[PDB]
Structure 1
Amino acid sequence: HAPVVAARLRNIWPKFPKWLHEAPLAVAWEVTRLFMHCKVDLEDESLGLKYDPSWSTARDVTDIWKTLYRLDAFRGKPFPEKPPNDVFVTAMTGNFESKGSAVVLSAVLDYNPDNSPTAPLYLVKLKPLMFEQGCRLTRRFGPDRFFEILIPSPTSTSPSVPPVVSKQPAAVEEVIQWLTMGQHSLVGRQWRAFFAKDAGPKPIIKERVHFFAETGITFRPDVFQRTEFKVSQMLDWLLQLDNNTWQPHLKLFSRIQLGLSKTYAIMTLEPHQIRHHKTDLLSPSGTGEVMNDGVGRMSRSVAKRIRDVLGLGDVPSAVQGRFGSAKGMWVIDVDDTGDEDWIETYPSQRKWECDFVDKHQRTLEVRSVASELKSAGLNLQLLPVLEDRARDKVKMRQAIGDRLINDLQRQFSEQKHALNRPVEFRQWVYESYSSRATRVSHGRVPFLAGLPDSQEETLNFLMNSGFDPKKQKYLQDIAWDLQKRKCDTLKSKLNIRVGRSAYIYMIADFWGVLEENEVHVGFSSKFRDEEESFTLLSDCDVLVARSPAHFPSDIQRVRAVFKPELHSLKDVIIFSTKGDVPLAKKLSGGDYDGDMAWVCWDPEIVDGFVNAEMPLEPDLSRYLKKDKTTFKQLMASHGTGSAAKEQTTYDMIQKSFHFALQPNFLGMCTNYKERLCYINNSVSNKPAIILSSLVGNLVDQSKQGIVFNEASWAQLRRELLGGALSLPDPMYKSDSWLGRGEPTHIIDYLKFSIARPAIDKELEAFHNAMKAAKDTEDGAHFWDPDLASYYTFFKEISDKSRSSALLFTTLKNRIGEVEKEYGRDPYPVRVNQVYEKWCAITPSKVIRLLELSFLADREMNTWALLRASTAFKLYYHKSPKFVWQMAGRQLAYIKAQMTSRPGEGAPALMTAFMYAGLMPDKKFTKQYVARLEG
């Protein structure tokens, strides 16, 4: 209770008018969207609203907008963005649920640029209805009963946040109280907050908040659409709270995310088909250490059902999933020769005490599946630890630089060789970038004016009509804008490719075949590495790590040993369940609940590596303070019974919001550690081990109820390190070397001594080169007599003219006016405006032939060809970008017309749709060139 805030926080939501009370939910939503967008008051008695019965039977939102919109006070504009028909129909007539898809109600709030109280504080914009995969909670209660917002974080220091908030300390408490203390009215429902989390110049970070429709003017009571139902009951259904009062309430709150997790429901197992283990697999040595933390077995038939329902090409050996209170990985049991469905759970997987009675508690839900692997490369964060652990560091670093030089050299040589032939450049362009998703989405290649959106797509579009990148300059210009942008990217991550490396899901050996420092890795298909290929790993040492590696021991060298017993388990890496300490825990305190290991079998990287043992970690208890207050202790303030428990549930939501919305130090302490280790150039000295242990403990902050605030951070740096004082940014944060002398920090050296010279050297190759291009024959020109084809044709006619002649003159004149327009708001919109003036350049018996009006698409007439060529003749000079951008499309037609030769095959006129479905045939390219070259 500030109050300042309020009154601000009025009144934040759009009102729900009486004329609109006959809904339905989806109409209410999408109509409210047209009103807010057009800036139209929904409680206006000047507009004569109303309610179109027709909206009730609507199958396209555009019908409930053209209403409307009409009225005159709606124009505007057009838009809102608009929900897709199939989505809208589902929301209208399919229960907000289409197979696995939920219809999602969402909004984004931004601070009100306005001011004074009693202005809102937040502006709300309602997103269009959309599909997203459902989750346990939307399958149980209905997708239409869930609402989510993105909202500016109330503890966001700073500086672009309203004064009104935070120069008024706690009302951070007022914002949360607004969020959580009562119901929010939106589109005729009563929404209550039950979850908050982080989101999926310098902007204000937003937090995602989830609301549940507890009631609304369509619901009905109760005990004992659509029935009234409280958040406390919903969460009790999810978490079986009676049996989980022993839990730290912040940790219990964090489990709510497991009901919100977007998942694929696979199948519901019968109780007799479920095996709950009372104990985990423990260390053979008696350490009591859990050896299979987060991982269990499933039958083979269960995995086949997953292939089936998900439509996988193959039975997956392991999946990341949920099952009642259980969360983690399940791996096929290699000993399963039956055909009966079963799954097991282990204590380490079960996040609350669950009776597993209702079918939703016994449904296997899949988050992700073990899939075919792809090369991982080396991330620069692994490098300091790899260098630290090197038997010989000078050689390691010479080798890594040589590797970067070679790979770069290698990619340049392939680009420049491919550039020498249209079939080959097309193949190279196609391979350089995937356009399939864009093509699938549009049912064609999208165009901006007369050319594809995409530079890559523009190159191939033009080459497919016969242009040559070594002959035409525009093609040339784009080809190298592309190579430039790619150089920029390389100098900005140090993701050195290591062909023999991959990120692989970690699984534990239930079957007792792997000795302690042995791992089993078999692949589902051929893993290729330039000259060599692998279907599995055997008799070699490998490096394993989890990102990020902080401790010297966070990367381990072990032996890859293929066990025939585990042959069927593919695209996972199996760790031993022997020894004192699971291998997973050595990899940055990891486990088997979805962790993936960086696995490296590259000999040069593996062979110089020496294992370090686990660090003696410091006691950080003075700084890291765990709130261990249980749900039972919170309930003691209210008493006993149902009302006591209900209020305790809401207490937990409010106290946990107050915890979730505190600043994140993980990021801050990680950056300090980056900076400190950089200046020290050490990841293994005492300060380094302290900060790595620190950030390690902050990862589980939320479910450990660790309180760590500013005073404690300062105290900890005061007492154990620095340098309150900002540490300087590493030099590698800058674009150029701003250091003194030669780089010393392996990253500085790789970016500044190695990468930067090599890049600039590789770019001096074809600016050289540019430059090397008058009448060698070769080279590359804007001129192409083929494209002045129709120009010269009609000038001849034109001669001769009488009055064609006059038509031809108007044409040249108008083109001139439009090039002037091109000379002079976002970019695509301005280009369109000019394109539209361009297309507006329009013409017995000669005009009829040029116009071909029986064609619905103007831009396919002979006139368009003539207009394009005339513009080319007049402006290839002069304004090359103008002509190509407007008329690229018809220049291409003309080129394909002109280069055609009798008896040398037929040019193909492809529809936009059918063209989008073809790709370059790499075998054709390869075989055709091979025959060209003798």
Structure 2
Amino acid sequence: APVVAARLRNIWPKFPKWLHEAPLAVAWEVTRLFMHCKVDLEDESGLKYDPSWSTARDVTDIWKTLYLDAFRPEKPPNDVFVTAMTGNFESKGSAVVLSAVLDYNPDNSPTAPLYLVKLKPLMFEQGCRLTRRFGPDRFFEILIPSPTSTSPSVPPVVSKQGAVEEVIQWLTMGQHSLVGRQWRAFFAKDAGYRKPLREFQPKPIIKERVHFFAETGITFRPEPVEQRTEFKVSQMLDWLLQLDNNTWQPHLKLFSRIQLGLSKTYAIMTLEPHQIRHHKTDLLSPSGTGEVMNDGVGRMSRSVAKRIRDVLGLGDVPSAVQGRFGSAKGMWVIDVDDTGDEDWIETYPSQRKWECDFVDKHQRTLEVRSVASELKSAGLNLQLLPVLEDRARDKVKMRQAIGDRLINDLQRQFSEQKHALNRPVEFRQWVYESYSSRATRVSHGRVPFLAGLPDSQEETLNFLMNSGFDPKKQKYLQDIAWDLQKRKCDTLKSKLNIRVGRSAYIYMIADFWGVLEENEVHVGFSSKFRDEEESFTLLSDCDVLVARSPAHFPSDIQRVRAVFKPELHSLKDVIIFSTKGDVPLAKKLSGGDYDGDMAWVCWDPEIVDGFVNAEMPLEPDLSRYLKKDKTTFKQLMASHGTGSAAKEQTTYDMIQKSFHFALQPNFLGMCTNYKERLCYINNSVSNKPAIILSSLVGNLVDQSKQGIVFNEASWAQLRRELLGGALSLPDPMYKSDSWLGRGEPTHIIDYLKFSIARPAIDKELEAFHNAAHFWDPDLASYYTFFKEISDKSRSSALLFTTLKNRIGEVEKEYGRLVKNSKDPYPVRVNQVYEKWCAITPESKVIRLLELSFLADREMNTWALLRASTAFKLYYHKSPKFVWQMAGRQLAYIKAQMTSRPGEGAPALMTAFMYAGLMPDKKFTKQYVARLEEYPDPEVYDGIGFTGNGDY
């Protein structure tokens, strides 16, 4: 399609000759500024390089020189820029990423570029093996609309014509020029439906993520970032996958293994070849079935596990980790029989995804994606409910048990909060336990504010309570707590994520020591697992349910027996399955294994007791509709022969053909939804259509790895021959907010949502509402003060009258930009906030109000008076305005006004020092007990309470 080809010639910004000597980081950031301010990099209207940029340490400094009338963007953080300039794009396991977003040009001119490009700011991301081996600067990733999209918003030039093949060819046929480097595509992955960037002029469109490698560049030589050697993608992938020994593999599967080189991992240690135990065979079934029982799982030495703890800074030695090691991926577990101190790791065939020689350091490096960490209570999901009911001996009882768990959870949640609201110290404790903000505080070094309040609703409640506000007395705080509760109730109504205290998601591991019989599992916790009035350190003498998400077949949930084996006691925060029996238990859980799969584990006796296991179903033959492309790399090489030249050309062919495969429309979501709609209509997940759809969805998830081909024609045919045909199925009633159904709900999800959840939530909300004014005379104290001065002074009255009028203008701006767009809400609030802060006195009175010697104007007396006056005028009319603009100063006033002589001292803490503090649970309990008698140990030579007296 030639018309598209013309539109595929000028997509990338040009690299001007005047930037040819700039570092990669400056070249990237200058290019970004010109694109943002719509200035041509080749404009001759006078551009020449500035040597100051080469030694720069802030992006703003480079941009200031540019901000010329033509110039007069989001900035990379200074730490990232310094790492890009001096740190060789790496810092403490973090890599500097070069990434861009593309969208279809809304200009339909035949000469116009098809895509518009937004280069993203330099950012840090976890490194991977390929970046560690070749350098983060040699990698570039984009999001681009999928040329196969069926969306109405696809431009006619692609939709009308050979264009999809022309777009696919543009991505992979040759090198792309950008910031002085030649980039060649090596990998692509579905990125889901993404809304186009607002700056590019709102329907979501499916996009692909494409990875490029810098094969050559101006600074490249036939290692520092500025002194790189020419290296082809074909050589890059050959280093990773050692293709000469892997030609026997289906080329689509081989291509999918590239993800192992891109996996975001923490480098722990390099092992020497003599410390690596490569096993020739997996653990096989004792029965002789041939089934593998340790798929994805191997053992590691205790010393390796200690090194992981040390490198990652863990408080404890991990029992198991999700990792990668050369060609091996999956889980590694501590060998409980290791009494030695030698570093060693073992690999199994089921872990090794290609033939690897493990020679290069980076192919002998243990990389950890995640560690098995302390567990938390989990809950149910929509997929588990129909299967639990299907396998219930008494379906009425099972439905009653799940419903009781819902009512009990809501009752406890509302009860705990209503009690905490009676005391600020107790509500602060409750709010802190409700949400986590440590990550943001650490990354920002402070509580991030939006205008005059913390960005977070929970941080706002604690910030205002810390300054003396009472959630029973101040309606604004009451409103925040109400909004937070409403959101949680809505999530329950939408997802039925019913909390089960005796439940958790745990990494699955296999028993290399043969102590577990089939149908026995071992679960030991690293610490106390709390469930209301009861606690666990292990599971024993009880039945449990295990399952994986997604669960579809009736057999995808299994009832097994928890047995604690002392031999395994050191293995904590994992669930261990038997390696005996005909079939590994993991395989029964939606085709699971031990390579990072997690199991939902439930020991709730009321949910467990009624469950009857089903046998794994005979899967229907769907080969009429599902076609498998198993062409091997060797078969692709027949087009070229043998030798280095043939291997090189074949690698680029694997990439091109895999890109074509990767870009074909995927039907996993459409088929899963059809299954939900049809199985709802039939109220069955075990009848003939349910088994067909469950078998189909299980195949569509493994599509890229298995080379499954399944297009619209095959989906139409499958529906016609085995399902309801072209008929569009309606949504289940539970997708709606109310039961519009005739009679009383009968489907378990309808019943749980409309007969149990909605009524309970309505009653608990009314009781919460039954269990406060915007007005607070303390907050009007500064206004009353100045009004008295203004009454006896004409100069003060003019200042006072100007202030009121200026506040009124900003409030109207709040109503127009926020209360009632290309600009997102935070940007719109900032715009109002900047006009608010512009309200300044612009002489002894003016000087005392301004306190100009303070760098922060928000800390002077004027800011206090401005906040008080705004409160008096708008406390009731526009509460969101007064609090969002002046909440910070309202808290200052409250803390000043509630202070009493002799009763201690309020503390003005810095933003950094405030961020590092947390509520003291022991203080809360001890203080409340004093206010309102066995000394609770967790509340009050290590020997503690052993008796009050001596008798």
Q: Is the contact between residue 401 and residue 607 of structure 2 (CA under 8 Å) also seen in structure 1?
A: no
1:609: how far off? 0.7
1:815: how far off? 4.1
Which has the higher mean CA deviation after the structures are superposed, 182-191 or 477-486? 477-486
1:106: how far off? 0.8
Identify the residue that residue 44 of structure 1 maps to in structure 2: 43
1:830: how far off? 4.4
CA distance in 1: counterparts of 2:289 and 2:642, whole angstroms: 41
Which has the higher mean CA deviation after the structures are superposed, 660-669 or 705-714? 705-714
1:931: how far off? 1.8
1:853: how far off? 3.1
TM-score using structure 1 length: 0.94
Q: Is the contact between residue 424 and residue 465 of structure 2 (CA under 8 Å) also seen in structure 1?
A: yes
C-alpha spacing 1:329/1:826, structure 2 compared with 1 (3 Å) = closer
C-alpha spacing 1:758/1:630, structure 2 compared with 1 (3 Å) = same
TM-score using structure 2 length: 0.93
C-alpha spacing 1:793/1:561, structure 2 compared with 1 (3 Å) = same
Q: Is the contact between residue 10 and residue 118 of structure 1 (CA under 8 Å) also seen in structure 2?
A: no
Q: Is the contact between residue 900 and residue 906 of structure 1 (CA under 8 Å) also seen in structure 2?
A: yes
C-alpha spacing 1:802/1:646, structure 2 compared with 1 (3 Å) = closer
1:299: how far off? 1.3
Q: Is the contact between residue 389 and residue 610 of structure 1 (CA under 8 Å) also seen in structure 2?
A: yes
C-alpha spacing 1:148/1:786, structure 2 compared with 1 (3 Å) = closer
Matched, 1:669 2:661: no
C-alpha spacing 1:816/1:50, structure 2 compared with 1 (3 Å) = closer
Mapping of residues 905-924 of structure 1, within 5 Å: 905-924=904-923
Q: Is the contact between residue 402 and residue 607 of structure 2 (CA under 8 Å) also seen in structure 1?
A: no
C-alpha spacing 1:873/1:549, structure 2 compared with 1 (3 Å) = closer
Q: Deviations over 1:260-317 (max 9, x none)?
A: 1111222121121111111111110111111111111111111111112122111111
Q: Is the contact between residue 102 and residue 117 of structure 2 (CA under 8 Å) also seen in structure 1?
A: yes
CA distance in 1: counterparts of 2:89 and 2:74, whole angstroms: 19
C-alpha spacing 1:245/1:859, structure 2 compared with 1 (3 Å) = closer
C-alpha spacing 1:243/1:720, structure 2 compared with 1 (3 Å) = same
CA distance in 2: counterparts of 1:421 and 1:759, whole angstroms: 24
Q: Deviations over 1:177-204 (max 9, x none)?
A: 1111111111111111111111285411
CA distance in 2: counterparts of 1:807 and 1:431, whole angstroms: 46
Which has the higher mean CA deviation after the structures are superposed, 241-250 or 716-725? 716-725
CA distance in 2: counterparts of 1:341 and 1:820, whole angstroms: 68
1:818: how far off? 4.6
1:238: how far off? 1.1
C-alpha spacing 1:209/1:795, structure 2 compared with 1 (3 Å) = closer
C-alpha spacing 1:815/1:183, structure 2 compared with 1 (3 Å) = closer
Q: Is the contact between residue 295 and residue 593 of structure 2 (CA under 8 Å) also seen in structure 1?
A: yes
C-alpha spacing 1:684/1:73, structure 2 compared with 1 (3 Å) = same
Identify the residue that residue 810 of structure 2 maps to in structure 1: 818
Q: Deviations over 1:575-595 (max 9, x none)?
A: 111111111111111111111
CA distance in 2: counterparts of 1:809 and 1:62, whole angstroms: 39
1:804: how far off? 4.0
Q: Is the contact between residue 83 and residue 90 of structure 2 (CA under 8 Å) also seen in structure 1?
A: yes
CA distance in 2: counterparts of 1:529 and 1:850, whole angstroms: 55
Q: Deviations over 1:735-793 (max 9, x none)?
A: 2223222111100111111111111222223445xxxxxxxxxx933333333333333
CA distance in 2: counterparts of 1:68 and 1:112, whole angstroms: 27
1:799: how far off? 4.8
C-alpha spacing 1:818/1:716, structure 2 compared with 1 (3 Å) = closer
CA distance in 2: counterparts of 1:625 and 1:808, whole angstroms: 79
Cα RMSD for the two superposed structures: 2.3
Q: Is the contact between residue 317 and residue 331 of structure 1 (CA under 8 Å) also seen in structure 2?
A: yes
Which has the higher mean CA deviation after the structures are superposed, 337-346 or 560-569? 337-346
User: 2:285 pairs with 266, 283, 286, which one?
Assistant: 283
CA distance in 2: counterparts of 1:613 and 1:467, whole angstroms: 60
CA distance in 2: counterparts of 1:837 and 1:430, whole angstroms: 33
C-alpha spacing 1:542/1:482, structure 2 compared with 1 (3 Å) = closer
C-alpha spacing 1:354/1:853, structure 2 compared with 1 (3 Å) = closer
Q: Deviations over 1:83-127 (max 9, x none)?
A: 122211222122222231221111111111111222110111111
1:698: how far off? 2.3
1:839: how far off? 3.6
C-alpha spacing 1:143/1:860, structure 2 compared with 1 (3 Å) = closer
Q: Deviations over 1:558-615 (max 9, x none)?
A: 1111111111111111111111111111111111111111111110011111111121
C-alpha spacing 1:677/1:459, structure 2 compared with 1 (3 Å) = same
1:837: how far off? 4.1
C-alpha spacing 1:804/1:627, structure 2 compared with 1 (3 Å) = closer
Which has the higher mean CA deviation after the structures are superposed, 900-909 or 866-875? 866-875
SS at match of 1:764: helix
C-alpha spacing 1:494/1:817, structure 2 compared with 1 (3 Å) = closer
CA distance in 2: counterparts of 1:600 and 1:265, whole angstroms: 34
CA distance in 2: counterparts of 1:656 and 1:799, whole angstroms: 80
1:513: how far off? 0.6
C-alpha spacing 1:848/1:358, structure 2 compared with 1 (3 Å) = closer
SS at match of 1:331: strand
SS at match of 1:670: helix
Mapping of residues 671-710 of structure 1, within 5 Å: 671-710=673-712
Which has the higher mean CA deviation after the structures are superposed, 891-900 or 338-347? 891-900
SS at match of 1:32: helix
C-alpha spacing 1:535/1:637, structure 2 compared with 1 (3 Å) = same
CA distance in 2: counterparts of 1:260 and 1:878, whole angstroms: 54
SS at match of 1:519: strand
Q: Is the contact between residue 386 and residue 609 of structure 1 (CA under 8 Å) also seen in structure 2?
A: yes
CA distance in 1: counterparts of 2:909 and 2:325, whole angstroms: 51
C-alpha spacing 1:43/1:692, structure 2 compared with 1 (3 Å) = same
Q: Is the contact between residue 87 and residue 103 of structure 1 (CA under 8 Å) also seen in structure 2?
A: yes
C-alpha spacing 1:352/1:683, structure 2 compared with 1 (3 Å) = same
Structure 1: 5+ residue stretches without partners: 769-778
SS at match of 2:4: coil
C-alpha spacing 1:54/1:335, structure 2 compared with 1 (3 Å) = same
C-alpha spacing 1:630/1:787, structure 2 compared with 1 (3 Å) = closer
Identify the residue that residue 20 of structure 2 maps to in structure 1: 21
1:511: how far off? 0.6
Which has the higher mean CA deviation after the structures are superposed, 725-734 or 456-465? 456-465
Identify the residue that residue 773 of structure 1 maps to in structure 2: none
Identify the residue that residue 59 of structure 1 maps to in structure 2: 57
Q: Deviations over 1:646-694 (max 9, x none)?
A: 1111111111111111111222222221122111111111111121112
Structure 2: 5+ residue stretches without partners: 193-201, 817-822, 932-951
CA distance in 1: counterparts of 2:825 and 2:475, whole angstroms: 23
Q: Is the contact between residue 149 and residue 205 of structure 2 (CA under 8 Å) also seen in structure 1?
A: yes
Q: Is the contact between residue 10 and residue 119 of structure 1 (CA under 8 Å) also seen in structure 2?
A: no
C-alpha spacing 1:875/1:722, structure 2 compared with 1 (3 Å) = closer
SS at match of 2:28: helix
C-alpha spacing 1:811/1:555, structure 2 compared with 1 (3 Å) = closer
SS at match of 1:574: strand
C-alpha spacing 1:833/1:673, structure 2 compared with 1 (3 Å) = closer
Q: Deviations over 1:547-566 (max 9, x none)?
A: 11111111111111111111
Which has the higher mean CA deviation after the structures are superposed, 305-314 or 843-852? 843-852
CA distance in 2: counterparts of 1:680 and 1:629, whole angstroms: 40
CA distance in 2: counterparts of 1:695 and 1:803, whole angstroms: 77
1:803: how far off? 4.9
Mapping of residues 392-403 of structure 1, within 5 Å: 392-403=394-405
C-alpha spacing 1:864/1:639, structure 2 compared with 1 (3 Å) = closer
Q: Is the contact between residue 301 and residue 341 of structure 1 (CA under 8 Å) also seen in structure 2?
A: yes
Which has the higher mean CA deviation after the structures are superposed, 800-809 or 459-468? 800-809
Q: Deviations over 1:303-356 (max 9, x none)?
A: 111112122111111111111211111111111111111111111111111122
1:806: how far off? 4.7
CA distance in 2: counterparts of 1:235 and 1:833, whole angstroms: 49
User: 1:72 pairs with 60, 66, 69, which one?
Assistant: 69
CA distance in 2: counterparts of 1:576 and 1:384, whole angstroms: 27
Q: Is the contact between residue 405 and residue 500 of structure 2 (CA under 8 Å) also seen in structure 1?
A: no
1:807: how far off? 4.3
Identity of aligned residues (%): 100
Mapping of residues 752-831 of structure 1, within 5 Å: 752-768=754-770, 780-801=772-793, 803-824=795-816, 826-831=824-829
What is the number of equivalent residue pairs in this alignment? Answer: 914
Q: Is the contact between residue 219 and residue 226 of structure 2 (CA under 8 Å) also seen in structure 1?
A: no
1:889: how far off? 2.9
C-alpha spacing 1:41/1:616, structure 2 compared with 1 (3 Å) = same
C-alpha spacing 1:709/1:793, structure 2 compared with 1 (3 Å) = closer
Q: Is the contact between residue 101 and residue 143 of structure 2 (CA under 8 Å) also seen in structure 1?
A: yes
C-alpha spacing 1:127/1:881, structure 2 compared with 1 (3 Å) = closer
